[PDB]
Scaffold this motif. Structure first.
Motif, short mmCIF file in Angstrom:
data_model
loop_
_atom_site.label_atom_id
_atom_site.label_comp_id
_atom_site.label_asym_id
_atom_site.label_seq_id
_atom_site.Cartn_x
_atom_site.Cartn_y
_atom_site.Cartn_z
N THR A 1 8.28 13.98 5.14
CA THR A 1 7.68 12.72 4.65
C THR A 1 6.80 12.98 3.45
O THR A 1 5.84 13.76 3.56
N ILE B 1 4.88 17.19 6.31
CA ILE B 1 4.61 16.63 5.01
C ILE B 1 5.42 17.38 3.96
O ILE B 1 5.44 18.63 3.92
N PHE C 1 -3.06 12.25 6.81
CA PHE C 1 -1.70 11.74 6.59
C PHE C 1 -0.73 12.22 7.69
O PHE C 1 0.17 11.47 8.12
N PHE D 1 0.89 -1.19 0.00
CA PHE D 1 0.00 0.00 0.00
C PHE D 1 0.90 1.21 0.00
O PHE D 1 1.61 1.45 0.98
N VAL D 2 0.90 1.96 -1.09
CA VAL D 2 1.74 3.16 -1.18
C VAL D 2 0.87 4.34 -0.74
O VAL D 2 -0.13 4.63 -1.40
N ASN D 3 1.20 4.96 0.39
CA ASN D 3 0.34 6.04 0.92
C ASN D 3 0.89 7.38 0.51
O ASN D 3 2.04 7.70 0.82
N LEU D 4 0.06 8.16 -0.19
CA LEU D 4 0.48 9.48 -0.68
C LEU D 4 -0.44 10.53 -0.13
O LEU D 4 -1.64 10.38 -0.21
N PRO D 5 0.11 11.63 0.39
CA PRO D 5 -0.75 12.74 0.86
C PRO D 5 -1.28 13.57 -0.29
O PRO D 5 -0.55 13.86 -1.26
N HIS E 1 3.29 14.56 -6.90
CA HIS E 1 4.00 13.27 -6.77
C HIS E 1 4.40 12.81 -8.14
O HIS E 1 3.63 12.94 -9.10
N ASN F 1 10.24 3.69 -6.44
CA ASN F 1 11.66 4.05 -6.52
C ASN F 1 12.01 4.90 -5.33
O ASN F 1 11.39 5.96 -5.13
N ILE G 1 4.53 6.91 2.40
CA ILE G 1 4.73 5.81 3.33
C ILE G 1 4.51 4.52 2.55
O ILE G 1 3.50 4.38 1.83
N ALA H 1 10.14 10.06 -3.53
CA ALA H 1 9.74 8.76 -4.05
C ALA H 1 9.16 8.95 -5.43
O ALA H 1 8.61 9.99 -5.72
#
Ligand SMILES: [K+]
Ligand code: NA
Lengths: 138, 145
Positions: B77, A64, A56, A6-10, A120, B14, B80, A73
């Protein structure tokens, strides 16, 4: 053993993000989707959670990041062929996404990139099946 | 029809790392295997499942992939990465191992009963979660639990 990812993105606006990714052809799991989080399905084994920034913030002790200012990322999804790469990336750009890097084109590998509505960085990339090699112990 | 589900894609996350060898060893201790075809001194391809991978990319090389400065994940951050666990003991074994191998505490363990997770920052400060959920929560969603 395999684990789910699970890739969590704000995101600033869950509804806007959910619409953007829906336009790209992603399905959402309604059982994990509400006003503060949308559960984007990439495959049976991987999901991208689009999480309202205020929610988040509960998950980290750090501020953040601003993804328009720094990159921590990059999320890359595979594509079925070169036309899928172009359709996905062109659709993203038309849906409010912005340019990231030049296309990567080796003929038998082809990838494109964009920043999403929250900055992102995404890639979409195809590799020839004749080219695409298994898990081994470290 | 099983075609009611749209065509799946593979997922690669990545991440920039200061030392690919140290990062590969860290995740190897957590039970992850690596794909040799996509692993070298500059990038290690961690296999999470048949359809999800984490590319641990040397920080200098990672700069090729973005026009922005690379984030300091110990200061901010952006994302996650959460992986599932088979049971509550797997959550504890995974998180305990990470913490004993140079990982650092991110947030207190979160025990909702139907869901149990722990989190840590990895050697490069990227924030990870390992989380078990009951079959009931997986079908019904947390909202109904
Ligand atoms: K917000
Ligand atoms: Na916080």
């Amino acid at each position: 053993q395999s684990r789910l990812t699970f890739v969590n993105l704000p995101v600033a606006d869950v509804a806007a993000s959910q619409a953007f990714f829906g336009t790209l052809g992603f399905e959402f799991n309604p059982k994990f989707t509400d006003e503060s989080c949308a559960c984007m399905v990439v495959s049976e084994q991987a999901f991208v959670m689009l999480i309202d920034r205020a929610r988040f913030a509960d998950f980290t002790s750090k501020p953040i990041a601003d993804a328009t200012a720094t990159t921590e990322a990059i999320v890359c999804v595979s594509a079925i062929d070169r036309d899928d790469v172009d359709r996905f990336a062109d659709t993203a750009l038309g849906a409010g996404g912005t340019v990231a890097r030049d296309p990567m084109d080796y003929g038998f590998m082809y990838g494109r990139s964009f920043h999403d509505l929250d900055g992102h960085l995404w890639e979409v990339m195809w590799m020839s099946a004749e080219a695409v090699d298994m898990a081994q112990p470290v």
